[PDB]
Write a protein that binds this DNA or RNA. Structure first.
Lengths: 189, 8, 190, 8, 8, 189, 190, 8
DNA sequence: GTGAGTACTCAC
DNA sequence: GTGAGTACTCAC
């Protein structure tokens, strides 16, 4: 798997303070320790490099939220974990969180934003779902619009991470969070 | 539940 | 005068159109303004001194419009809501300058410009923490949630709504269905 | 009250 | 002789 | 006298350590304290600006040697003053000297160096005019070829116009002139 | 190896040519090699380096020989001739490298490069200081004119010939009738 | 008698 | 104000 | 290795 190292080298470069700047196929070929000819004997363009990295984001986040909706039947505790999968995942993966926010992909094909756009749209749906079910699990529907409350929670989740990147990962997402969650469920009605 | 870390 | 602003219009249009996803190269931008790339370097030294001006514009539009709020209504609720409609209303009324706000347009540019928007972000939030502390005075009551924590959660939502305006290519309006949202935001206010 | 715009 | 200068 | 204030501004510029670099018609106006349009509504180009500077050498040197001859008659004396005339005009106008040496002519059109070659062509034959008139004056001619005699001396002067340039006006030409003199005088054997 | 020392050639081929009087651009420099403006930067990090290698060559050549004129020739006076012929022999033999030696080719480049040449002309004038300083060491009778006021005069002569070698588009060759010009110089070893 | 000629 | 370079970068 | 953008220049 001498192809993995390249992606690892893409992360370690997207995690450093040079991440705010473009990642040349030059200073990328430098790290792994080969020429720009061996880069392209494993990938067609720079897109696929981000494609694969993004694809791991999809799976990882998607396979976990699924897992939650199965082993966790509590409507409240549900998103109390889901919102931690995110904010947790950001603080765990500095470089990747530039792909989400849409700073890193600001150099390549716009089609890579679409990939991510769908992910939020998918995260926001399986999150919307958790809100809907509260009905059939408790009879008492929501005193607030399910899609409206759905989005509203994602906003905070795309804000905490955007504040994260902006200050080179100094305002870490999950910090003072146990004191932060009560401001979210405070909307659960 | 555990959060994965690609940057190994 | 007549010309040291026309240039910023062209940068703006490109910044909220299809090409906001790429960088506004002086060659690209020239074709917009309608004068050669050389006439671009007759008002501003660098490309970076263009964006800088475009930032300062925001640096006043929000705080100056907020100082006004504080003086017109002193009720903290009414106030904590007018400020939220500001940063949202602006970002939506100006699609272009929002790519700047969210520091996405600056990616192709100097990291220094970010350093300036982060400060712009401070003052807004630094203003917030004050309003909360003032409510204990106009009406002897406050909040039970820490002022900073509470402040850094509102900004979050506002910062979080602007990031959706951009990546949806200006489809998903920020102040849209606002009057329904704010009751949810006012819920963590206790 | 009045949200300004850069573009006319 | 005297040698002339431009710096008048 | 605006067609003498620009020239003065320019001459000073070649003296500043910004002399090594290409003088632009932009920073020229700035120093003068006007617009680029307050420069070109006079001179049709830079070539004229520099041509008007070339002249002041032709005049304050050619006509100045000719004046020596009329007045000074002794050969060893004449062959000294002309030398001082060179090395002297240099240290007093280092701005004009970069023009003389050619360095500050690398930026302008080539017609100017050719017109500087001419300056040298005249003062060399003029040196050869003083060498010829030794027989007629003192019944006897030099044992060395006059064509190569003068050239040999003019060689010594350019190489003292160069060292003044290389070092940025610390290797002055007129330093130790009572000393250097018997050496080239001993050449006149 | 080759790629490097094949472009330095082309660069020199320009310095000697009619264009050598103008700035040597990246565009035109590619025209000689026939490659792309990018291909060059695959072998040099900058055009500045293209001129540092040139200077090393001149610095390694003239100076090798000078350290080779002593350990083969002790004749206090014959030395100078070999030096004064070495310097003027290099010029005539290397028209393009002379244009950097004189320092006209340096004009379109950076002042940093000038120090090199000076520091060379100052190691050469020091080689000369030595040759003549050593005279009394050989035969109990040295000079009257100070040795440094001499070494200057000697090398001063050279920078004059090398200047005429250039500003005449290479028609005034320095070695020409050196044999006749020389008794004039040797007459200055007083 | 050995003049290092750079060019071709 | 501009036609025309201007040393150097980038993805492939 | 290369075609193509890349911010900014200079003389007229």
């Amino acid at each position: 798997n001498r192809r993995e190292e390249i992606l690892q080298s893409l992360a370690l470069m997207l995690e450093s303070s040079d991440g705010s700047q473009r990642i040349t196929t030059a200073k990328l070929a430098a790290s792994v320790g080969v020429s720009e000819a061996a880069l392209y004997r494993h990938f067609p363009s720079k897109t696929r490099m981000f494609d694969s990295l993004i694809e791991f984001i999809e799976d990882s986040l998607i396979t976990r939220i699924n897992l939650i909706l199965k082993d966790e039947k509590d409507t409240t505790a549900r998103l109390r974990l889901i919102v931690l999968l995110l904010l947790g995942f950001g603080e765990r993966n500095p470089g990747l969180t530039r792909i989400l926010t849409g700073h890193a992909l600001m150099f390549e094909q716009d089609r890579l934003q679409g990939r991510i756009n769908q992910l939020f749209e998918r995260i926001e749906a399986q999150l919307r779902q958790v809100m809907r079910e509260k009905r059939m699990r408790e009879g008492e529907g929501y005193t607030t619009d399910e899609t409206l409350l759905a989005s509203q929670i994602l906003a905070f989740c795309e804000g905490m991470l955007s504040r994260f990147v902006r200050s080179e990962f100094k305002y870490r997402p999950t910090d003072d969070f146990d004191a932060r969650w009560p401001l979210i469920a405070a909307q659960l009605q | 539940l555990d959060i994965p870390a690609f940057l190994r």
